[PDB]
Structure 1
Amino acid sequence: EEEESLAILRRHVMNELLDTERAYVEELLCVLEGYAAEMDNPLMAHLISTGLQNKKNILFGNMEEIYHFHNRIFLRELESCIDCPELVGRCFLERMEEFQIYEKYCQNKPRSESLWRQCSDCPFFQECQKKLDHKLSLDSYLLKPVQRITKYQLLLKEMLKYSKHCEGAEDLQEALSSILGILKAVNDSMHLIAITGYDGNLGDLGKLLMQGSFSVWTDHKKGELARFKPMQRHLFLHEKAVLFCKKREENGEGYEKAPSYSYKQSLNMTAVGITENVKGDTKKFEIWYNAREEVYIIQAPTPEIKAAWVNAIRKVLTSQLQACREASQHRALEQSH
């Protein structure tokens, strides 16, 4: 009977989810104690320099906080879903806010990487590894948090696949979307912190809603441009503005391969407009300013991405319209004299 099969397949996903959660917790711990705590061990102090000891928080980011969360809350909560795996979605929904800690770890990861590029050879590490009987280096364990947050989505999608007829399929779908939401937010923010040359508080632009690289043409009113040959710009869609930056693929020393973005201009959402369809190319749309006196023809890599941007811009323009509506309604009620 198909029901029995799916129930059995649901069990397999729960087992993998639970077994992998445990290995994850144990692995963070063996490194927190086998490396981090060892940086403050007198018996070891003669193998590590003080420069490295002070950069401990940069090397491990907030791994301890992550460990504590999983080892005191999440693992325990997953274990309470064993008898009914379909309800594991609720489990995630209840802790969505807690996962926000992954943003911190991910934003710091490249920083930690830079440090590891210079002290990976350090005798302290080679020593700690021998004591642990580990065959893989520390940085490989430092990747685990990044790898873990990017599997939950896979696991939830799988559970959902075997729970389409289960009471709880809705929570699974919402948990999946929410987890994908956090992964998107974190990934998006990695681009944001790489913006340079911006005079002001990026936090005042409101939430970052979308980011991506695009080919862009300009069709500004008569009286940097890209009239015929498109220019490359990385756009950041915030609630209050659209930022245009130029990707600085240029490097230096100790080559960080992650490119940075040089701020070029900002379009205030209050005067932004959009054009959903462009002739000849289904993946093009337009973002114009001050009623088309400035027009940017954006070419998305895919039609789906174009749609994602049009929808997000429209949600923002819609909320802007309602906000003004409400505003001109309260001060309109001032007819009290």
Structure 2
Amino acid sequence: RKKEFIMAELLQTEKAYVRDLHECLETYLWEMTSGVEEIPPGILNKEHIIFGNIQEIYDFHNNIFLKELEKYEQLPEDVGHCFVTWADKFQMYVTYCKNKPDSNQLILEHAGTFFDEIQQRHGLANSISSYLIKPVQRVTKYQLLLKELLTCCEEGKGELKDGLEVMLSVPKKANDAMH
């Protein structure tokens, strides 16, 4: 029963993470690239700095990772292998984290209220900053979920250890990549 609640949460939160990145890309990013609106010269053509590689992070989750996590729904004790299989894709969070301080200052020093007006107009509870921290949050959370699976799965559960290993290595490598 506990392994099931943890798997359910893994999945429900993966879906929400996918929905959150999708909203970020289709509201805040789309207003920059669209050509529907006046973009401060401070940030013009600087969407690569603002959003880092979040598009590529989203494509991973939305094209691959969520569909594969779904396949492990009845195999919670095996889900660490999902992370092992896709370890290389998670390397993009290293790039994302590296960039995030540059992202935040750019929005601070140069965007004025561009993104706040987008938020108001779209009626979003979350600000561009709230959305842009999410990848940092999500990549440090997988290891918590796996640890919880370790507390309630048998010794046929090094299909968690190796997963957790990867999911501890990624955020550490991201952390160590910062200035």
Scaled by the length of structure 2, what TM-score is found? 0.94
Partner of 1:155: 145
Pair 1:184-2:172 in alignment: yes
Partner of 2:87: 96
Partner of 1:35: 28
Measure, in 1, the Cα distance between the counterparts of 2:40 and 2:107: 14
AA aligned opposite 1:32: L
AA aligned opposite 2:176: D
Pair 1:83-2:74 in alignment: yes
1:96-118 deviation per Cα after TM superposition (whole angstroms, max 9, x unaligned): 11100000000000100111212
Instruction: Report the Cα offset of residue 50 of structure 1.
Output: 3.7
Alignment partner of 1:91: what SS? helix
Pair 1:21-2:9 in alignment: no
Partner of 1:131: 121
Alignment partner of 1:134: what SS? coil
Alignment partner of 1:127: what SS? helix
AA aligned opposite 2:47: K
Unaligned 5+ segments in structure 2 are none
Write 1 or 2 for the structure with the bigger share of helix: 2
Pair 1:108-2:99 in alignment: yes
CA contact (8 A) 1:40 1:53 kept: no
Alignment partner of 1:162: what SS? coil
1:65-105 deviation per Cα after TM superposition (whole angstroms, max 9, x unaligned): 00000100100100001112111111111011110000000
Alignment partner of 2:177: what SS? helix
Partner of 2:160: 172
Aligned pair count? 179
Measure, in 2, the Cα distance between the counterparts of 1:84 and 1:60: 34
Partner of 1:52: 43
Write 1 or 2 for the structure with the bigger share of strand: 1
Partner of 2:53: 62
Alignment partner of 2:81: what SS? helix
Structure having the higher Rg: 1
CA contact (8 A) 1:13 1:155 kept: yes
Alignment partner of 1:52: what SS? coil
Percent of residue pairs identical: 45
Instruction: Report the Cα offset of residue 128 of structure 1.
Output: 1.2
Instruction: Report the Cα offset of residue 120 of structure 1.
Output: 5.1
CA contact (8 A) 2:10 2:145 kept: yes
Unaligned 5+ segments in structure 1 are 1-7, 195-337
Measure, in 2, the Cα distance between the counterparts of 1:63 and 1:41: 17
Partner of 1:251: none
Instruction: Report the Cα offset of residue 38 of structure 1.
Output: 0.9
Instruction: Report the Cα offset of residue 21 of structure 1.
Output: 0.5
CA contact (8 A) 1:87 1:171 kept: yes
Considering Cα pairs closer than 8 Å and 6+ residues apart, tell me whether 1 or 2 has the greater RCO: 2
Measure, in 2, the Cα distance between the counterparts of 1:60 and 1:143: 10
Scaled by the length of structure 1, what TM-score is found? 0.51
CA spacing shift, 1:178–1:44, aligned 2, 3 Å: same
Structure 1: which 4+ aligned runs deviate by more than 6 Å? none
